[PDB]
């Protein structure tokens, strides 16, 4: 019952961060193989998956510090709440370069996406220009 | 007939740039009001729209120089072809701060989009963690 209060505190911290973000305008997932479901249940396997995934999200929060620079107070609160949750599960139980490489690849995919949008519209506007100048 | 060769040269330059981009992985449009269509045709109004739009795309190419730094030779070719096309239409006939503000707003919308993707998956993984830890 104590874990319920810890996770919801993090969920509300996330809900605040995304609300602060909206006003301006391959991630871990649970699988049957992990044993966190009643069928194929493996508490030792499932607990490692929960800790591992949280450790992976803990560094994505670190790389997103510059994203929430105007509301620094909560950005650290979500990290500390995650760290406290991770420490609790680690006691209850017995790489970052790859995540930074993915996060850099994600941002090129968006910048290339903006690049194609600009160039495709340039192409499309040129087509309309030639069709118009063809008549003059 | 000379304009046809000039615009297609630019279109092929764009086709090369986007092909160089894919291997790694409010813009102007024509409207009836502009008079470039046979109905409502206004050669003086339409020619100003063609020149104006090309001038707007000419600075988006300038802000995209860092996007094509590995193939600099073609990035300058598309700009010079556009400038030659713009100069021809300007002889045939009788702000950038806003475009940079839009281009900066476009990139925040993508970074916020990545930010929400990371935080929403963090939220979703936390939900699965609580549902799993609730059973242990």
């Amino acid at each position, epitope marked *: 019952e104590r874990i319920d209060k810890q996770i919801r505190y993090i969920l509300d911290g996330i809900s605040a961060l995304r609300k602060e973000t909206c006003n301006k305008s391959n991630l871990p997932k649970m699988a049957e193989k992990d044993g966190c479901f009643q*069928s194929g249940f493996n508490e030792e396997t499932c607990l490692v998956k929960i800790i591992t995934g949280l450790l992976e999200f803990e560094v994505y929060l670190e790389y997103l510090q510059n994203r929430f620079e105007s509301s620094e107070e909560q950005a650290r609160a979500v990290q500390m709440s995650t760290k406290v949750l991770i420490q609790f599960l680690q006691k209850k139980a017995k790489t970052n370069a790859s995540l930074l490489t993915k996060l850099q690849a994600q941002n090129q995919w968006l910048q290339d996406m903006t690049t194609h949008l600009i160039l495709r519209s340039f192409k499309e506007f040129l087509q309309s220009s030639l069709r118009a100048l063809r008549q003059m | 007939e000379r304009i046809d060769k000039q615009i297609r040269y630019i279109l092929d330059g764009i086709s090369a740039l986007r092909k160089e981009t894919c291997n790694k992985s409010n813009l102007p449009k024509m409207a009836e009001k502009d008079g470039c269509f046979q109905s409502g045709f206004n050669e003086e109004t339409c020619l100003v729209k063609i020149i104006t739009g090309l001038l707007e795309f000419e600075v988006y190419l300038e802000y995209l120089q860092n996007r094509f730094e590995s193939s600099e030779e073609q990035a300058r070719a598309v700009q010079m072809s556009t400038k030659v096309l713009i100069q021809f239409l300007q002889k045939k006939a009788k702000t950038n701060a806003s475009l940079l503000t839009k281009l900066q707003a476009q990139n925040q919308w993508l970074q916020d989009m990545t930010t929400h993707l990371i935080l929403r998956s963090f939220k979703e993984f936390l939900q699965s963690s609580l549902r799993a830890l609730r059973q242990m």
Partner: antibody, heavy 122, light 109 residues
Framework: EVQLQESGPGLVKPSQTLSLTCTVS??????????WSWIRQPPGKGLEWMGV???????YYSPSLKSRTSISWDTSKNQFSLQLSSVTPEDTAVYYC??????????????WGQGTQVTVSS | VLTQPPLVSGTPGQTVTISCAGA?????????VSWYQQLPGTAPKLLIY???TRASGIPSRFSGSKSGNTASLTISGLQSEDEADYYC??????????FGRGTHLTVLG
């Protein structure tokens, strides 16, 4: 007391899009930790769970309906709405909006609307 | 979907059982299995949630059971007023819900 009310046209023609709106009374739709779902019932058939929207605004859809189903909301009116695309007679159903008391730890629905009937026909 | 028998029947005062066969991605995940009662012309009424927990005002004769991937609804002391359509629902990963076809409980005699 939580009350749900469905509103929408009783007739939609084939290939048109189906739009319904659920108005929530007695509670904010942005309150933790509620989820707001749409369930439909073809005549003489079973209940089909379509989608759901969080208190955060996040949407989740059935895989069968994900291509043509959209769920949005208007927090100022305390409403969430449904949009179904390219409707067919297979979409003739009574549509229900229901509340999830805690989206975090369970997908069951305690408070239901009165249901609105939509007939697909030209 | 969730497999559910078409008809179930019984005379007053006797017990009936309604089953809800599921798969590993729905009932097998977290056992978030709910049960609903629906009378004609009205919305479904939540009876049981999380397999066993009864909603407020639901009598004890309605019981929630589960074994394997199959949940069962047990209605003791059948009344003539109990004739309705009974649905089971389950959480489906991820953040999905699925209902059974439903069972019509017919009170005979």
């Amino acid at each position: 007391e939580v009350q749900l009310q469905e509103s929408g046209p009783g007739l939609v023609k084939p290939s048109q899009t189906l739009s319904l709106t659920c108005t929530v009374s007695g509670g904010s739709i942005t309150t933790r930790y509620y989820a707001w779902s749409w369930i439909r019932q073809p005549p003489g058939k079973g209940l089909e769970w379509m989608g759901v929207i969080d208190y955060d605004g996040d949407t989740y859809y059935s895989p069968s309906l994900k291509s043509r189903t959209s769920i949005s909301w208007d927090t100022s009116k305390n409403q969430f709405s449904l949009q179904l695309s390219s409707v067919t007679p297979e979409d003739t159903a009574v549509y229900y909006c229901a509340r999830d008391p805690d989206v975090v730890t369970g997908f069951h629905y305690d408070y239901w609307g009165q249901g609105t009937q939509v007939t697909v026909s030209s | 979907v969730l497999t559910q028998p078409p008809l179930v029947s019984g005379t007053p005062g006797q017990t009936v059982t309604i089953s809800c066969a599921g798969a590993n991605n729905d009932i097998g995940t977290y056992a978030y299995v709910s049960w609903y009662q629906q009378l004609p012309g009205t919305a479904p009424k939540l009876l049981i949630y999380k397999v066993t927990t009864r909603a407020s005002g639901i009598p004890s004769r309605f019981s929630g059971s589960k074994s394997g991937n199959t949940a069962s609804l047990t209605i003791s002391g059948l009344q003539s007023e109990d004739e309705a359509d009974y649905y089971c629902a389950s959480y489906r990963n991820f953040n999905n819900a699925v209902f059974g076809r439903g069972t019509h409980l017919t009170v005979l005699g």
